[PDB]
Amino acid sequence: NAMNALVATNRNFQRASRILGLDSKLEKSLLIPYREIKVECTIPKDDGSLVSYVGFRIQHDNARGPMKGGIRYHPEVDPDEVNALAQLMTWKTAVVDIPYGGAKGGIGCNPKDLSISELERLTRVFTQKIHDLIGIHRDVPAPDMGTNSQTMAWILDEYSKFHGHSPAVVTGKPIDLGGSLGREAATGLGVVFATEALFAEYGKSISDMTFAIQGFGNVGTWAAKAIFERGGKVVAVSDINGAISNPNGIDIAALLKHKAGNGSLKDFSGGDAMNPNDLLVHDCDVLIPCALGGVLNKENANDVKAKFIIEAANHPTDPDADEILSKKGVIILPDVYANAGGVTVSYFEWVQNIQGFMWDEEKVNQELKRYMTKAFNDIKANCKTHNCDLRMGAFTLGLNRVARATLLRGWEA
Amino acid sequence: TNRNFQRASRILGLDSKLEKSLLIPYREIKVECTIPKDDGSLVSYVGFRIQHDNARGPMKGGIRYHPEVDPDEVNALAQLMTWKTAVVDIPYGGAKGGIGCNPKDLSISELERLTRVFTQKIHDLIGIHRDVPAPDMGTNSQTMAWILDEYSKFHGHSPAVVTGKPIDLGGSLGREAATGLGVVFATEALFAEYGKSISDMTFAIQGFGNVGTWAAKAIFERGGKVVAVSDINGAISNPNGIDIAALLKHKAGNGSLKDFSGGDAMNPNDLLVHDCDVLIPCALGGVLNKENANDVKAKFIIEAANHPTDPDADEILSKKGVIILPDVYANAGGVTVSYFEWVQNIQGFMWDEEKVNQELKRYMTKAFNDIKANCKTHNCDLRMGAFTLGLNRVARATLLRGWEA
Amino acid sequence: MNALVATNRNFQRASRILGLDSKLEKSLLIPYREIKVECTIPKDDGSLVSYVGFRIQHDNARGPMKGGIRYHPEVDPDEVNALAQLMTWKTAVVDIPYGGAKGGIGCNPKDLSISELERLTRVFTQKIHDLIGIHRDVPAPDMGTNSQTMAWILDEYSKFHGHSPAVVTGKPIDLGGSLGREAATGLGVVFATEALFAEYGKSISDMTFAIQGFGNVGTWAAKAIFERGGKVVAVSDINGAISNPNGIDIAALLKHKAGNGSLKDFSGGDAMNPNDLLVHDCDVLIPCALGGVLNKENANDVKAKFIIEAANHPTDPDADEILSKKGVIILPDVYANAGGVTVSYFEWVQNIQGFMWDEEKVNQELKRYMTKAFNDIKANCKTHNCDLRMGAFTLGLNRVARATLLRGWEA
Ligand SMILES: NC(=O)c1ccc[n+]([C@@H]2O[C@H](COP(=O)([O-])OP(=O)(O)OC[C@H]3O[C@@H](n4cnc5c(N)ncnc54)[C@H](O)[C@@H]3O)[C@@H](O)[C@H]2O)c1
Ligand SMILES: NC(=O)c1ccc[n+]([C@@H]2O[C@H](COP(=O)([O-])OP(=O)(O)OC[C@H]3O[C@@H](n4cnc5c(N)ncnc54)[C@H](O)[C@@H]3O)[C@@H](O)[C@H]2O)c1
Ligand SMILES: NC(=O)c1ccc[n+]([C@@H]2O[C@H](COP(=O)([O-])OP(=O)(O)OC[C@H]3O[C@@H](n4cnc5c(N)ncnc54)[C@H](O)[C@@H]3O)[C@@H](O)[C@H]2O)c1
Numbered sequence A: 001n002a003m004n005a006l007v008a009t010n011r012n013f014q015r016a017s018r019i020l021g022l023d024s025k026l027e028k029s030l031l032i033p034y035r036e037i038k039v040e041c042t043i044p045k046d047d048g049s050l051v052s053y054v055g056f057r058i059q060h061d062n063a064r065g066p067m068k069g070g071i072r073y074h075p076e077v078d079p080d081e082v083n084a085l086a087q088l089m090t091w092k093t094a095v096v097d098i099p100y101g102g103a104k105g106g107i108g109c110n111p112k113d114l115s116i117s118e119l120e121r122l123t124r125v126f127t128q129k130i131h132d133l134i135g136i137h138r139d140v141p142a143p144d145m146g147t148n149s150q151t152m153a154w155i156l157d158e159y160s161k162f163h164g165h166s167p168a169v170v171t172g173k174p175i176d177l178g179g180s181l182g183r184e185a186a187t188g189l190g191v192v193f194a195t196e197a198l199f200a201e202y203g204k205s206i207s208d209m210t211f212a213i214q215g216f217g218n219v220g221t222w223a224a225k226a227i228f229e230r231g232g233k234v235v236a237v238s239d240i241n242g243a244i245s246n247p248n249g250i251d252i253a254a255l256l257k258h259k260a261g262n263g264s265l266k267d268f269s270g271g272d273a274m275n276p277n278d279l280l281v282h283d284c285d286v287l288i289p290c291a292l293g294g295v296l297n298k299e300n301a302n303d304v305k306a307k308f309i310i311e312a313a314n315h316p317t318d319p320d321a322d323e324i325l326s327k328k329g330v331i332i333l334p335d336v337y338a339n340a341g342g343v344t345v346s347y348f349e350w351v352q353n354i355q356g357f358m359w360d361e362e363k364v365n366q367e368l369k370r371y372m373t374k375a376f377n378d379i380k381a382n383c384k385t386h387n388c389d390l391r392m393g394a395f396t397l398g399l400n401r402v403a404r405a406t407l408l409r410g411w412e413a
Numbered sequence B: 001t002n003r004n005f006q007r008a009s010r011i012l013g014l015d016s017k018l019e020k021s022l023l024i025p026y027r028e029i030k031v032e033c034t035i036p037k038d039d040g041s042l043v044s045y046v047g048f049r050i051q052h053d054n055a056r057g058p059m060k061g062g063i064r065y066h067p068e069v070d071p072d073e074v075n076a077l078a079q080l081m082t083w084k085t086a087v088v089d090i091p092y093g094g095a096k097g098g099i100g101c102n103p104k105d106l107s108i109s110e111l112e113r114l115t116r117v118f119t120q121k122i123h124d125l126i127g128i129h130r131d132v133p134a135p136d137m138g139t140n141s142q143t144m145a146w147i148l149d150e151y152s153k154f155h156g157h158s159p160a161v162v163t164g165k166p167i168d169l170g171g172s173l174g175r176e177a178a179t180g181l182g183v184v185f186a187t188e189a190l191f192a193e194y195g196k197s198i199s200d201m202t203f204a205i206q207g208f209g210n211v212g213t214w215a216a217k218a219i220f221e222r223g224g225k226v227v228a229v230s231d232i233n234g235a236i237s238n239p240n241g242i243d244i245a246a247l248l249k250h251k252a253g254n255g256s257l258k259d260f261s262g263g264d265a266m267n268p269n270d271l272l273v274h275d276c277d278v279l280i281p282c283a284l285g286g287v288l289n290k291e292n293a294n295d296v297k298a299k300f301i302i303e304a305a306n307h308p309t310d311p312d313a314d315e316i317l318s319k320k321g322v323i324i325l326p327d328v329y330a331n332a333g334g335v336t337v338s339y340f341e342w343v344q345n346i347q348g349f350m351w352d353e354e355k356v357n358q359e360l361k362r363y364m365t366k367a368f369n370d371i372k373a374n375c376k377t378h379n380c381d382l383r384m385g386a387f388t389l390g391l392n393r394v395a396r397a398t399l400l401r402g403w404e405a
Numbered sequence C: 001m002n003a004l005v006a007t008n009r010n011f012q013r014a015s016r017i018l019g020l021d022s023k024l025e026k027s028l029l030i031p032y033r034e035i036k037v038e039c040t041i042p043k044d045d046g047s048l049v050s051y052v053g054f055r056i057q058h059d060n061a062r063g064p065m066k067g068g069i070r071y072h073p074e075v076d077p078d079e080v081n082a083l084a085q086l087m088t089w090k091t092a093v094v095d096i097p098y099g100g101a102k103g104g105i106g107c108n109p110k111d112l113s114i115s116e117l118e119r120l121t122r123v124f125t126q127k128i129h130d131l132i133g134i135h136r137d138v139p140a141p142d143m144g145t146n147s148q149t150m151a152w153i154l155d156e157y158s159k160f161h162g163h164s165p166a167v168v169t170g171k172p173i174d175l176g177g178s179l180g181r182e183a184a185t186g187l188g189v190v191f192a193t194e195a196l197f198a199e200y201g202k203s204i205s206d207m208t209f210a211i212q213g214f215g216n217v218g219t220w221a222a223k224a225i226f227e228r229g230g231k232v233v234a235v236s237d238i239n240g241a242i243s244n245p246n247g248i249d250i251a252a253l254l255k256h257k258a259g260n261g262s263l264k265d266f267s268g269g270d271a272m273n274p275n276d277l278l279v280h281d282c283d284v285l286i287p288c289a290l291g292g293v294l295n296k297e298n299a300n301d302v303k304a305k306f307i308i309e310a311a312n313h314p315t316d317p318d319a320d321e322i323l324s325k326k327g328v329i330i331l332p333d334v335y336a337n338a339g340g341v342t343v344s345y346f347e348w349v350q351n352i353q354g355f356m357w358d359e360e361k362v363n364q365e366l367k368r369y370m371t372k373a374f375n376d377i378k379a380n381c382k383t384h385n386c387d388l389r390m391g392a393f394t395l396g397l398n399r400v401a402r403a404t405l406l407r408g409w410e411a
């Protein structure tokens, strides 16, 4: 069903470039990634047998600063997916106006099939194969799907053997190893800040709406929690194993405790088991994909019931679906704004580390709000000047900023 | 000592294999330091650096120029600095080093050459984010200036590479007063927990040096009544409280305590058993023992000197309901401000004195609250609450980092 | 030779007030390092041109070196050395943790296209990348260079060492430049003046001002004085001058200028002899234009009680003597115009901290630095029973001398 992820993202890039009127020589330069790296990651399993993976780091653009983006452990990781995500990082960092470029990495593995000692070895080997290509002022990784703060701990620890203690080389670290308060919740919280800014334009509140949510990991859990706390009615949640629904609202706080006690969604007592394939076409006001990309496509977009889609996941909606949904009257808050809370707080974590001195947690949340509000106000204005939809409003905002810094740096050797 | 670490480890439930790792220093270094004397003849010494642990950050710790060098003591002191940095939540581990020499046999140009050669021999083993030396017995801010200057030849201008620098070369404001003022901030936090205030308390202070003078000044300006003060030479007392400003002006004029006109001269041997609410040992260790602990009148003991109270006195004083703020925490103002010095250097932008003392108060207050919460968790006294808090923080960082190669 | 004569004289006088040892003095006058490098590029037509680039690194006892890059065909090593040495004293006066440097390329930028300038800037950076750096020596714009030049240096240097925003100042804001730079010098002039006047329990609004020069310094100084209730009664630039004894409306004058009006055509004042500027009736004179304008032939006719030296070296030694004798208080240039270098320090700090300040913070920090430095200068004048120029130079020199002596001399 999914359209190729890089095809889809390049169509969006082209659409934004045509709005800005970029010439084709500058456009070509901004499309092509600065550097693509593929490296062998081979480790012994716990029984001593060998397994070989290919690890990727795509460094898409560094005109606005060191490159930034997470590392994904997932069986569908491939060069196309990583190139698409790295490119999106470049635009997203420029949308929230933090001094980073864009990058992304990953390994095509299934963490569920690997022991924790095997994941550690795989993470350290991957770090050994890319340490020369990343760095505090060069490219700063972070967690994405299938990774978490413990993953980043291992990267920090292995990288520091080659370059000395380097807290700022990775973000999403545990608090005890230099992480920032607020970073774990930042993406889902940022999704809610972005949603609140949007709904304010319609005079609506989150407490007026019903929500369906696909995915229930780092982004989905914190997003659902924050919506729930503000009085939103979360009527359906899915993950890779099952789904749960309740037209009166799921008690998300109880769903999260159930999950932490290792329960499956479909066994939750406060809801009805649901086929997860029904999630995206479920009746709701607001749909929030928090899992894979490309899941809203030509084949299901006409059966979406929501009036709003908040892109918490990266590129959940492909260009075919964009157009179908636009004709249905659906408003889509794009990934390159809505899920930017995470990289924004990663920036604060990095600042705190290089300043050698941590901020109070209230400053982290004060600034997150300030950055997400400023960026929504920039997107609004850009939509007005370019008479475009929210996706292109944000995409052209970031692309234009990246073009401006690239031209400023020049091209002579 | 060994058994104490074991009780802390067991209170926390640490695995024996983790215990073993935490007791093995990260790295131990001995290097030849040979220099020409002023007359051109050679002298050879051995310099050393024990780098105990860096789970929580770069190591840090003093450089001792002293002839008696016991390897086991140097190891123990490095380890203690690992716990201490963790108690006050600053991002370092512990280290200790020095040179086995007698600085009284060396001219000032010989000491400089010795310091520079030593730095030449260890420059690859230290650094702003690796190991950050500091002054100790036999060394001072001039020693640190010479390390900075020589180290910077190898790695470029690196002010954060040592602490205790002169202000002209990036030292922090507030460094002189940091330990004694920190003692007072710690006491303010302790007292607030029991609902008490400096201004309602009487204090007896043993020792009137860098710590005692600043601690007394800070208490005095907060309305505390300093009713007794001693040093090695004598002692002075006044039940209505000594005018500490006038006593400090008197000390400064080369005046001795006993001849201070604003008080009644006292036998220094009477200091620890003096009537008072708070006793502050700021001089020597080993002063409260089995033979005199039952005679302490204070209900609070603020340990600024290192290990003033031995185990027998701890137990005697607990039976008496006396609360003892332990040295590892109470005197940590100095090491906390040395962190702030590193931060200021790293950021290339100095703090004014108000900001240094604000951050000092914030760190000392949050660390007391952390110690006390840890006491409630493990139902233990402040001494062990502080030890277990530092130890557990190091263990937690070590476990998060992992063990695979 | 403007900067050579001023700095050497002032250095020598300050050295003697302090009683510095002669061997220390000798060391302090020798620069740490002098570098000249060949910079050869192809022109747009592919033919070669070869220039000599240079960097004098005078002293780094108090920190990394700091100073401008001049693209300019006239290079006398003597003057460049003096400029680099003067930055060493100047950074010390305002308690900035830098030493002094000065560099450039012996070229005429008007003979070069914009792509040729970029290639030259990049080749120069290739030839000095190993000698500069964030904690080693931090260049900045100067005559013939600008923030675009700095962007090119940053870009090329980062190829050798990674993103290094703090390696230069004066950057475009898009690449880590600081807010508040344009107003920095003129606003700093007013902060220094406010500190000075407080010693008399007086304020800007008590005073009448005559301002010579109306460019980057003069406009911002005039603006800040006017908004502080100061009465600007005369202003000159190179083409003419105007006076108004009830105060020129600086707001309206700025509008006039912004509309391409010539100063002398502003209707809100009377025509005046631009020579009568320095000797105009006023309480405060602020030379903001040229060096060498107060000399033994006009110093006796100055009417101001206060001279605030914003320009470089507006007052020659003879005038300095005459004016001290008439009781005139002179706030010296090494201090008074230091807002520019102070904000460039703040830019480096922001880049090092990875996080830019808003303009209010910059201006708050600028005022703190300029005020503290006045207070330190004034304390030194009391200690040494000397005028403000020597109080400044003794302050900066003693800070460098102390840092040097502490670092030591053994190998
Ligand atoms: N982690 C961050 O800070 C962050 C920031 C910005 C955007 N994102 C994006 O958010 C998305 C989720 O990331 P995460 O960190 O929450 O990952 P995660 O590994 O923490 O969780 C992934 C979740 O998605 C579910 N899922 C996987 N495949 C599914 C499927 N086919 N159908 C339904 N559910 C499925 C998993 O079961 C799990 O609940 C990704 O697109 C990621 O790139 C992450
Ligand atoms: N980071 C740390 O662990 C740290 C920091 C600072 C000080 N300290 C502890 O504090 C103690 C005091 O430090 P300081 O810098 O103030 O020392 P100091 O040398 O400045 O002053 C010591 C004072 O103790 C007095 N004294 C010495 N022997 C005495 C005795 N027998 N009876 C009474 N008074 C006596 C001296 O006369 C002097 O007044 C140190 O010895 C150390 O134990 C530890
Ligand atoms: N040392 C420092 O850090 C520092 C910093 C900034 C400026 N300055 C000095 O301040 C002065 C002015 O700098 P700026 O940025 O305002 O320059 P600018 O070029 O922006 O303005 C110069 C002004 O002087 C006027 N002028 C020129 N020749 C004149 C003459 N003969 N009589 C009267 N007015 C004349 C011009 O018309 C213009 O109004 C210069 O001496 C400059 O070097 C020093």
Ligand SMILES: O=C(O)c1cccc(C(=O)O)c1
Pocket (backbone or CB within 6 Å): A068, A069, A070, A071, A089, A092, A141, A142, A143, A144, A171, A172, A314, A339, A340, A342, A343, A346
């Ligand atoms: O840099 C980050 O923190 C990060 C981590 C994971 C995902 C993203 C993203 O923006 O998609 C950013």
Ligand SMILES: [Ca+2]
Pocket (backbone or CB within 6 Å): B021, B022, B023, B024, B025, B026, B052, B053
């Ligand atoms: Ca160990």
Ligand SMILES: [Ca+2]
Pocket (backbone or CB within 6 Å): C027, C028, C029, C030, C031, C032, C058, C059
């Ligand atoms: Ca010299």
Ligand SMILES: [Ca+2]
Pocket (backbone or CB within 6 Å): C038
């Ligand atoms: Ca040649």
Ligand code: NA
Pocket (backbone or CB within 6 Å): B037, B038, B039, B040
């Ligand atoms: Na000799």
Ligand code: NA
Pocket (backbone or CB within 6 Å): C043, C044, C045, C046
């Ligand atoms: Na050409």
